[PDB]
Design a protein around this ligand. Structure first.
Ligand SMILES: *[C@H](C)[C@H]1/C(=C/c2[nH]c(/C=C3N=C(/C=C4\NC(=O)C(CC)=C4C)C(C)=C\3CCC(=O)O)c(CCC(=O)O)c2C)NC(=O)[C@@H]1C
Ligand SMILES: *[C@H](C)[C@H]1/C(=C/c2[nH]c(/C=C3N=C(/C=C4\NC(=O)C(CC)=C4C)C(C)=C\3CCC(=O)O)c(CCC(=O)O)c2C)NC(=O)[C@@H]1C
Ligand SMILES: *[C@H](C)[C@H]1/C(=C/c2[nH]c(/C=C3N=C(/C=C4\NC(=O)C(CC)=C4C)C(C)=C\3CCC(=O)O)c(CCC(=O)O)c2C)NC(=O)[C@@H]1C
Ligand SMILES: *[C@H](C)[C@H]1/C(=C/c2[nH]c(/C=C3N=C(/C=C4\NC(=O)C(CC)=C4C)C(C)=C\3CCC(=O)O)c(CCC(=O)O)c2C)NC(=O)[C@@H]1C
Ligand SMILES: *[C@H](C)[C@H]1/C(=C/c2[nH]c(/C=C3N=C(/C=C4\NC(=O)C(CC)=C4C)C(C)=C\3CCC(=O)O)c(CCC(=O)O)c2C)NC(=O)[C@@H]1C
Ligand SMILES: *[C@H](C)[C@H]1/C(=C/c2[nH]c(/C=C3N=C(/C=C4\NC(=O)C(CC)=C4C)C(C)=C\3CCC(=O)O)c(CCC(=O)O)c2C)NC(=O)[C@@H]1C
Ligand SMILES: *[C@H](C)[C@H]1/C(=C/c2[nH]c(/C=C3N=C(/C=C4\NC(=O)C(CC)=C4C)C(C)=C\3CCC(=O)O)c(CCC(=O)O)c2C)NC(=O)[C@@H]1C
Ligand SMILES: *[C@H](C)[C@H]1/C(=C/c2[nH]c(/C=C3N=C(/C=C4\NC(=O)C(CC)=C4C)C(C)=C\3CCC(=O)O)c(CCC(=O)O)c2C)NC(=O)[C@@H]1C
Ligand SMILES: *[C@H](C)[C@H]1/C(=C/c2[nH]c(/C=C3N=C(/C=C4\NC(=O)C(CC)=C4C)C(C)=C\3CCC(=O)O)c(CCC(=O)O)c2C)NC(=O)[C@@H]1C
Lengths: 159, 64, 48, 160, 96, 161, 161, 160, 161, 160, 160, 160
């Protein structure tokens, strides 16, 4: 869900009509919104490169890519980069939304269990997410980076 | 009627999928007794591994 | 310019649209449980 | 078009159009007039865009217009330029539609297969589209260029 | 439970009209099915597949035809690994 | 199906022509009408149940059809008839937004006559109902919207005829 | 499907007759031809892409079909047409190995005319393409194989027309 | 036939025949001449094979030719022998084909249902086929017999 | 057959409506167009032989069709094909005067596909010939007439295909 | 999967090219192959009897078949013989393959859990498998028997 | 391998292996020894094949080993050669298996996606494989070369 | 031809043909029919072989078809292709003859001198012949290709 809906939901459980204090929180979000939209466009354009750089930092030139490693074979390599893309796309969605919930509902739920059955290494995946965050931070610029970082960290903590 | 609760994981070996497809990979399901036999075989043929089988409904070794 | 114009006029343009596999095949939408993770999505699934 | 997409989703659900869907339609109709102008600009400059892009492509890839290469000879070179013209026409259609779907049906599905039979190199075709984008961007105003760029980028992404 | 269902719809997808190219009459037959409204026509699109006669015999085909001439013409000649005296005594027409 | 914007595009594509001013004018015309159409569609959706009720009252009910031996006699048949009425309304609304009659041809109009003949549903009565819905719709949508709405209703009626 | 060996068997089975020398001779004839057929099939498979390319160049492309509003216009349609061409080639190869035209009737020929008419694909152009493929195939396979190859191609052409 | 089987697998895969598959076809066509001779031998000895097998079967199963039994009476005994003859003809067809498919379509599908309506015991029929195999094996040379045995065994397996 | 005047009348008759101004306007429109149509028709009639000659040269002749084993091989078949071409031309001229495509459906189009399939005449080639005639006709009739003439030719082509 | 593929897979994880030692194992398999094919044909033909004999040895004339036993009632009896058939078919597949993996992937996976929920007795099932092995051993003959036995034992160990 | 394929078809049908299927298995096991020798030859010549092919590729494509190009630099050039070595190892595995499946799972699925992320040009990779084929063909005897060629061709087809 | 060679040796010795020589003649006459087919195949595919080889050559050597280069211009390019066609015709003659002598007299003696006067580069011509060989090999079956290869190789050896 979204920051706006989150405020609404909090009021709805109370049963309270919308109040100025609530409105102020919504207003706060609205100011941040413009920045977020710009950041999202940057990420979308540079998505392929972001993944490439992050992979270079952590995934490739590693035991994983070497034979007997989890990311060995083309099929596994492709799967890992697909997962990386997912994380990036969802983080971008979360940043626009201003809420971490979407990450929980789609990405975070059942991922640990799936990975354990697959035998994918969680710590390495987390490493990759952190690497993406660093690359993203550069492109988006400082103001946007703080907002972007929290969602990346949320994914990492969940995993 | 007897029912089976089955948890099974199936990997997508033929093609990488852009869609998230979490549900297809890992699924817990209720199977009619008659259906389960065929379903079990189909999971095996796919190369999916059935982690857990339980009889959700009915009594084991019941004549009727 | 000449090599991208029709040799023959195409005097009733509608005839030449809607030739081939009908558009229905492409229009339709697919429904999955992975998309179901929302209350409205689920309702669409079921209707489908 | 956006409208077609909305209707199709509604029909599948067997429901009247949702307010959200209706809102998107409203936004699109407001955008359309601006979009029409962008399309008009490219149409007028079409001849020059194709010519300039062709030259750039041939400079980038000498081989294609060489005795070995597919593009070589007047007949073949014309066909290569005709292809570029086709893609430009598709891009204009896309801008007015507000979606890549019109572009996609005519140009991007089975494109690999068609060109492989022809033996035309797909990367060279992509370069030509990129070249056309650069020419088109220059004529367009910045915000207009960004809109046009998206459609151009899609084509380049489709063809590799 | 069958494989077709499993291959294409899987566990989580709702079936949809396939519109198949492939087997042969399948595309035209399916599309007649899809076009009919409920209760519009109850008639079988395919009562059953009618079996097909043979237009051409095996012997009419060129390669076979040739091989038949080679065995038929010069069926009777001289056999190698047969002593000549036995070969000269051998009869060609046989009966008749 | 097609919409007005796509219809223009498709006509040009078969010709192979780039979009021209005449084509642009048609597109421009659509864009102005668009806002009105969206408002009309929302009105129809909200009042759909009532529209059907009023139209049925005008033509279908208190008639031989509803009386025993009539096509709309029995609850099952009555329900079917009002379901069909709803279909016509929903599709006409879709067509009005689209600005193109094609969707009606592709989904509603194709095979309807044959279906009705097998069922023994009376076409003229159905047409009457469609015309009644049009009149009710015209009121709710208001005059500018009504003209646009009417053409699609008339298209359905002509097809069934 | 049916092949020469099975065709002989089936003819005898309907008669109820045990296999006889005359029947055996036909079977023997097939066995000799077999080796040639296998060589031809391998040639066709390796050169399949080129065969299609050449044939398209001869008949399909540089034509109104490829020009806008033509059946083979748009990438999707172009790809479909070359896919169909490949089908014809693959099935002809199967027929040549089999030594029987029946497979063509059972898979390719059945319902093709009707499919094409609904699609609006031009039959005569398709036939032209098949004939073109035949000519190219004849060259590659060489003379002994050519005659055998030609008959299956002609069979397809006659069926479609 | 072997060739039909190979083609069918290829068609399912939607591919041209593999080189390996082609090689197997080549081997089969070479083998065919030997196979024809094996079939010819059995055809000539057909009358005696059936007769001998019948006698063996009746010795093995007195019941079938007993007043209760299905085979009992001249008419019935003839029909039982006719059935044995049918199966032998099918076996010969199989040997030339190199596959059980010809045998299978004519004789093994719906066989249970047909015999159950007739009330003929299926195991007795199987014994008759086994008996025919033994007679046929004796007339055939050892390697020829092995080839013939496979087809005979299939029939016995089918009628079980 | 039906013509524009009669078509308006028939539409009103099914409604049972007396002729109204809107209907009158359509009739008036036809009356103005009439003079142009008559001139076009006279042009076509005078140049009919040449139109056929040119069109045949463009599509039919110097081809496999005319070569032995082709559909238009033998004098009898050649003569038949040009007779068919003449039919199409005459009927198109009738349609243009009438202002209605119905006559084409009633006389030419009905059963043509089936006739051709039994005969083994190639439909696509025939369509090609019709298109060729259209191009020649367009020149002779001149621009105002051309657009009107083209639609009937295209109608024939679409029907056959 | 297969003995050949198993060797390949072991090498692939190491990343090692195939070596002579590996080749020797493959060569060993190739010699054994001919024997295995003969054994498989024997088993297929006698499958119904093998099951019958094994049931007679262990399952029938027992408490299981008597009321209150697991295999009491026609439905349960039929299920048990169906399971017996599967074990036999998969063991035959394994013997041809030369690899135990197929048994793990097909038979062994999820069996224990299913049986425990059903309350089917594992030890009795194992007994049945061992009985089938003994019958199979006779039919296949000694050289084949050793090969056949290992797969039967593998199934038994898995179930236990 | 072939045997795995046969077993899998049988399991889908839930039937014992057909005689024809069994015969194909027999043929494969006989062929295997010849196949092993072909594989052994390539393994011994592996180091030289890779080296020669690399040089040919770099001559054919100066760009790849250029400052712009992916292959440029020692580290990168080594990786490019490592990739060539990987593909050769896969080909050897294929020859012994008698099927492309082993090759396919390790190397051909998701290959496009992997290389696109790396930004390595796919056509250049294909050329390298073609180059390796030519070197390998020269060392192999003609009939052996044809067998090896099929596997090499498949790789080239896959990476297209 | 083989026959001419044998006769010539005999006449030098002033003796009747030796048994060994006679045997070689016998072998040649048997081979001839196969040889004729190989030649026929290449003749039919001649137009395509030349075209494909030309393209390959021009890709391999841009310079020859460049303003400086000899091959450059339509007239010159035609002549270059005509030369390739000539060599192909000679190769066919060789195959039927069973010796390179026919090829040698028409094409390989004085070739250096002729081309040096023309200023055509001999190595480029050799590359074209190599290219033709590759195309020809693909159309020919493997054994046929080997036979054809020998004649092609000779030409390449002759011209350097
Ligand atoms: C990459 C950073 C690491 C890695 C990834 C990896 N993942 C798989 C397979 C799967 N991963 C997922 C995960 C998701 N599916 C979803 O829907 C979502 C949320 C949107 C996620 C994140 C799934 C379901 C699979 C199964 C296959 C599929 O296509 O769905 C693999 C393949 C492992 C295998 O053997 O199948 C890999 C390699 N592993 C690494 O080594 C990297 C550190
Ligand atoms: C009375 C208990 C309650 C009531 C009745 C009521 N009904 C109508 C109108 C109609 N009722 C029917 C129903 C049927 N038609 C059938 O074929 C069957 C099954 C055999 C039924 C039950 C129909 C069709 C009509 C429409 C009129 C017509 O027959 O043509 C009304 C009139 C209201 C209106 O809008 O028409 C009323 C009042 N309503 C109550 O309030 C009572 C509690
Ligand atoms: C109402 C004004 C008239 C009427 C209607 C009536 N219809 C049916 C049955 C059907 N109607 C349809 C029609 C459609 N299905 C579609 O998909 C479309 C286009 C979107 C239409 C318009 C269909 C297919 C059926 C048959 C299946 C079904 O009932 O759902 C009936 C029932 C007739 C019967 O014999 O069962 C009726 C009564 N009845 C009248 O008399 C009114 C004039
Ligand atoms: C130019 C950048 C590249 C190039 C182009 C090229 N194309 C052809 C031939 C054809 N290309 C098309 C393409 C299309 N048809 C469609 O419907 C669409 C989408 C609307 C496209 C883009 C077609 C159909 C042809 C065939 C000819 C015909 O139209 O009938 C050629 C020459 C063909 C040949 O190989 O002989 C060329 C050269 N070639 C390059 O190398 C450039 C990179
Ligand atoms: C090529 C020479 C001509 C051509 C081809 C063309 N085909 C289609 C569509 C279809 N093709 C088939 C045909 C077959 N199905 C079969 O099983 C067989 C026999 C094995 C054949 C030959 C089918 C069923 C279709 C429709 C379904 C589908 O496309 O999947 C098209 C239309 C494709 C489209 O997307 O619109 C075309 C263009 N058309 C030409 O102009 C050539 C003369
Ligand atoms: C020569 C004495 C005279 C002459 C001949 C001439 N003919 C053509 C063209 C064609 N003539 C035929 C004739 C036949 N087709 C048939 O089926 C038969 C019977 C078996 C005949 C005799 C055809 C079909 C053509 C058309 C071309 C084609 O074959 O496709 C020409 C040139 C055509 C033109 O006018 O451009 C000529 C010159 N002309 C003379 O003046 C001589 C007296
Ligand atoms: C008598 C009409 C026919 C006959 C009977 C026969 N039965 C057996 C052996 C068994 N019969 C059963 C039957 C049942 N078990 C059940 O649970 C039920 C359902 C309540 C039934 C009906 C069983 C299980 C056996 C196996 C032995 C055992 O019970 O332990 C035989 C012996 C065959 C053998 O080899 O065991 C016989 C002879 N035989 C006929 O031919 C009569 C017509
Ligand atoms: C027979 C030797 C013993 C026995 C068997 C028995 N099994 C069941 C029921 C099932 N057994 C299975 C097992 C499998 N399913 C598979 O897919 C495979 C791999 C091919 C196996 C081995 C399953 C799934 C069932 C449940 C449904 C079914 O019929 O398949 C029963 C019935 C028990 C019940 O309560 O219904 C029995 C009796 N039990 C014995 O008494 C023997 C020792
Ligand atoms: C050489 C022909 C071309 C080339 C190669 C190249 N590759 C890399 C990096 C990698 N290549 C692979 C490939 C594989 N890993 C596998 O598991 C398999 C299947 C068995 C393959 C084929 C991988 C995964 C990497 C990443 C590094 C690693 O694995 O340790 C590079 C370096 C580029 C980079 O960013 O890493 C290069 C240069 N490049 C060309 O342009 C040549 C045509």
């Amino acid at each position: 869900q979204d920051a706006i809906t989150a405020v609404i939901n909090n009021y709805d459980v109370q049963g309270k009509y919308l109040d100025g204090a609530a409105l102020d929180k919504l207003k706060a979000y609205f100011t941040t919104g413009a920045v977020r939209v710009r950041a999202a466009a940057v990420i979308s354009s540079n998505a392929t490169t972001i993944i490439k750089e992050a992979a270079a930092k952590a995934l490739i030139y590693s035991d994983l890519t070497r034979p007997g490693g989890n990311m060995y074979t083309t099929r596994r390599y492709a799967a890992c980069i697909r997962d990386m893309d997912y994380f990036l796309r969802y983080a971008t969605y979360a940043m626009l939304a201003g809420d971490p919930s979407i990450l929980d509902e789609r990405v975070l739920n059942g991922l640990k269990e799936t990975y354990n059955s697959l035998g994918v290494p969680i710590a390495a995946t987390v490493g990759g997410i952190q690497a993406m965050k660093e690359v993203v931070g550069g492109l988006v610029g400082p103001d946007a980076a703080k907002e972007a970082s929290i969602y990346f960290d949320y994914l990492s903590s969940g995993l | 009627s007897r029912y089976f609760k089955v948890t099974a994981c199936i990997p997508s070996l033929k093609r990488v999928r852009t869609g998230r497809e979490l549900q297809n990979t890992f699924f817990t399901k209720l199977v009619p007794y008659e259906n389960w036999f065929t379903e079990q075989q189909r999971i095996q043929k796919a190369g999916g591994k059935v982690l857990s089988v339980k009889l959700f409904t009915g009594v084991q070794g019941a004549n009727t | 310019q000449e090599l991208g114009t029709p040799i023959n006029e195409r005097s009733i343009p509608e005839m030449y649209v809607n030739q081939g596999v009908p558009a229905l095949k492409r229009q339709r939408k697919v429904f999955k449980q992975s998309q179901a993770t929302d209350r409205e999505s689920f309702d669409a699934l079921v209707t489908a | 078009s956006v409208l077609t997409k909305a209707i199709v989703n509604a029909d599948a659900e067997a429901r009247y159009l949702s307010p959200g869907e209706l809102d998107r339609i409203k936004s699109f109709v407001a955008s359309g007039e601006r979009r029409l102008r962008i399309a008009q600009t490219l149409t007028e400059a079409r001849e020059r865009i194709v010519k300039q892009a062709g030259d750039q492509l041939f400079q980038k890839r000498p081989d294609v217009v060489s005795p070995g290469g597919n593009a070589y000879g007047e007949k073949m070179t014309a066909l290569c330029l005709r292809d570029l013209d086709y893609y430009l026409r598709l891009v204009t259609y896309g801008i007015v539609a507000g979606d890549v779907t019109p572009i996609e049906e005519i140009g991007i599905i089975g494109v690999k297969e068609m060109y492989n039979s022809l033996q035309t190199p797909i990367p060279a075709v992509a370069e030509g589209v990129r070249a056309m984008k650069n020419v088109a961007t220059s004529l367009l105003s910045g915000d207009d260029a960004a809109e046009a760029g998206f459609y151009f980028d899609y084509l380049v992404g489709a063809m590799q | 439970d069958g494989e077709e269902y499993g291959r294409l719809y899987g566990e989580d997808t709702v079936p949809s009209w396939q519109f198949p190219t492939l087997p042969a009459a399948n595309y035209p037959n399916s599309v007649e099915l899809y076009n009919r409204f409920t209760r519009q026509d109850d008639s079988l699109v395919v009562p059953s597949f009618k079996p097909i006669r043979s237009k051409m015999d095996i012997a009419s085909m060129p390669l076979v035809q040739a091989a038949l001439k080679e065995q038929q013409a010069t069926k009777t000649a001289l056999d190698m690994s047969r002593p000549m005296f036995l070969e000269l005594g051998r009869s060609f027409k046989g009966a008749d």
